[PDB]
Amino acid sequence: KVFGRCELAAAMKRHGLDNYRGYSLGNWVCAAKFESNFNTQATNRNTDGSTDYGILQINSRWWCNDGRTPGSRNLCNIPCSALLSSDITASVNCAKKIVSDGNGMNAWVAWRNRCKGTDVQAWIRGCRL
Ligand code: NA
After folding, report:
1. Which residue, of 4, 6, 53, 78, has the greatest Cβ tally within 10 A?
2. For residue 51, what is the domain's CATH number?
């Protein structure tokens, strides 16, 4: 599924991401835009052989099991393919654990490089939330 901007914002808000660990909703929408272009089926391979999955590009090195990242961890206790679903519940619940791990949203390289320090509230402008 490719989400619309306000559709994703509303779904992220319903799942409790708005101001989760102090990150306003526009941060999460900005992160999803530049990580996946709002596409739940997005995948990208990393240099170490791990793969990033889903709308927030969650990495198989630490967070999910894709059966092809030997020696890795599965801290969200899910198969990576669950992160590709049109239902974003698993992505959001895993994202909550990542953002809680000490580094905040700096865990997402696209957020640090393209969202941090900008007017992230602009990403939810016009939405009925
Ligand atoms: Na893994």
Report:
1. 53
2. 1.10.530.10
